[PDB]
């Protein structure tokens, strides 16, 4: 409205006020999405971009949200025209909702740093006219509240946002960018992406999100960063709060990447009497296996860097091994290249130098070490296999000869009378192969000393050796 309702909380004064603001809009027909980022987005501006003058808490008041509120409303009213865009069925339109992205887009500033922090919220639409790609599409779902679409709700996948609304919520449409310098799509569906079955469509298994959800999304969106070395520990609180009573109302139930950040945040500063960091890792894990047919893949990296910072490298190898083994069943695409790079990572620096403490542990005496462990040596080999029938029928190759020297030197911190003791059967520890790169490869995993030019042959599909 804002309705008389919403108002009665005000001012807040902390914290937990913010919180039982949330709790209130949780508890209405509709929690109010505007509302609720301008509130986030002003408590992070005065936590984390400019600090002066605080004391304890900005207070929010009544008159500063409300003209705040205002001015998005009578943008949004001004420059959408719903009499121009006829509702059949109280559902929107195709043409309706590209103008709402339209008045968002346009109301931009020409020429900002896209991956500044603090540019996700409405605060910053309004104050800053600033946002980043999946906050344009959050405020385009905010606008489309504002303006009675009930119809209009955020989709996300792990890496991109758009809009998904009209007759049985069954459209699709693009309303933001994704990436630096590919081209939009706007307006269009994303069809040809999930048929195209890349990590950025999710092959379909994407969340479409209910108003709650959206909750959730602003919430994740909540950055606590003040600089590259300093968190605020307030904003860290208040994310934790509130994913807290999003997660005791249910509605963390079909977010996995939400129950990841919330483990993320207990690790650091666990609450007493609430579920350890692996439990809710775990949770995620079970979310996108109930909700989204095992498709995602941060659920498994959330419980990896979990156990790589807790050198549980047993369980960080099975973690990466897992993700692998999701990322086998996608085709390598254009616009993938985030998840590119995290597989890129954690093979090519984290393994390294999680192999390369553990050799040193090794070498001054440790029992139960990785490095003994076949069944570790059956991670790491089941991640590269992920990793190399992703590869397979993808439009684009993923590894190249970089690659091949840190897979030579990972093989070569386990011992080969450890290596020796997996046995790789066929189809038609124990470990199946499903790329025919690592079934070639077979061959060469088990020599006391590894074939280093036989194994860059395999892994590249490079086929001559020098000339000379
Ligand atoms: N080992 C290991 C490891 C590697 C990576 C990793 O990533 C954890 C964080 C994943 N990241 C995925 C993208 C996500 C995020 O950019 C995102 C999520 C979904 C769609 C979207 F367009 C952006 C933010 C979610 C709230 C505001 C945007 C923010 C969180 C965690 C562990």
């Known amino acids: 409205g804002l309705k008389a309702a919403q108002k009665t909380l005000f001012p807040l004064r902390s914290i937990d006020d913010v919180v039982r603001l949330f709790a209130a809009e949780l508890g209405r027909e509709e929690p109010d999405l505007v509302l609720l980022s301008l509130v986030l987005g002003f408590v992070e501006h005065f936590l984390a971009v400019n600090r002066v003058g605080l004391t304890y808490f900005p207070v929010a008041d009544l008159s500063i949200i409300a003209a705040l509120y205002a001015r998005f409303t009578a943008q949004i009213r001004g420059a959408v025209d719903l009499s121009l865009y006829p509702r059949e069925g109280g559902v929107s339109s195709r043409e309706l909702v590209k103008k709402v992205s339209d008045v968002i887009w346009n109301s931009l500033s020409r020429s900002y740093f896209k991956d500044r922090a603090h540019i996700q919220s409405l605060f910053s639409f309004i104050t800053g006219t600033k946002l980043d790609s999946s906050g344009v599409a959050f405020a385009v779902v905010g606008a489309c509240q504002a303006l009675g679409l009930r119809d209009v709700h955020l989709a996300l996948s792990e890496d991109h946002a758009w809009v998904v609304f ?13 990436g ?31 108003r709650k959800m959206e909750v959730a999304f602003m919430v994740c969106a909540i950055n606590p960063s003040i600089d590259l070395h300093t968190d605020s520990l307030e904003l860290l609180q208040l994310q934790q709060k509130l994913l807290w009573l ?13 129950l990841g950040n919330l483990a993320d945040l207990e690790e650091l500063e666990p ?53 692998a083994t999701v990322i086998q069943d996608y085709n390598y695409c254009r616009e993938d290249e985030e998840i590119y790079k995290e597989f890129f990572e954690v093979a090519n620096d984290v393994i390294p130098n ?81 790329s025919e790169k690592m079934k070639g490869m077979k061959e060469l995993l088990v020599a006391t000393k590894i074939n280093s030019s036989a194994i860059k042959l395999q892994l590249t599909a490079q086929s001559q050796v020098q000339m000379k």
Request: one cysteine or more; aromatic letters at 12%.
């Open 166 to 178: 009209g007759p049985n919520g069954e459209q699709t449409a693009e309303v933001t960018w994704h």
């Open 180 to 210: 630096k310098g590919n081209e939009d799509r706007r307006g269009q569906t994303v069809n040809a992406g999930v048929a195209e079955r890349s990590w950025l469509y999710l092959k379909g298994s994407y969340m479409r999100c209910d």
């Open 246 to 258: 999003l997660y005791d109302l249910g509605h963390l139930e079909r977010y996995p990447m939400a």
């Open 271 to 323: 609450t007493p009497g609430r579920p350890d960091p692996l439990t809710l890792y775990h949770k995620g894990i079970a979310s996108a296996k109930t909700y989204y047919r095992d498709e995602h893949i941060y659920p498994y990296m959330y419980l990896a860097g979990y156990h790589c910072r807790n050198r549980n490298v047993r369980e960080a190898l099975q973690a990466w091994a897992d993700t």
């Open 354 to 434: 999680l192999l390369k403490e553990a050799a040193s542990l090794l070498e001054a005496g440790s029992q139960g070490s990785a490095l003994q462990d076949p069944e570790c040596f059956a991670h790491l080999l089941r991640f590269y296999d992920g990793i190399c029938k992703w590869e397979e029928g993808s439009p684009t190759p993923v590894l190249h000869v970089g690659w091949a020297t840190f897979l030579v030197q990972s093989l070569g911190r386990f011992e080969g009378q450890v290596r020796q003791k997996v046995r790789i059967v066929s189809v038609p520890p124990v470990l199946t192969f499903q």
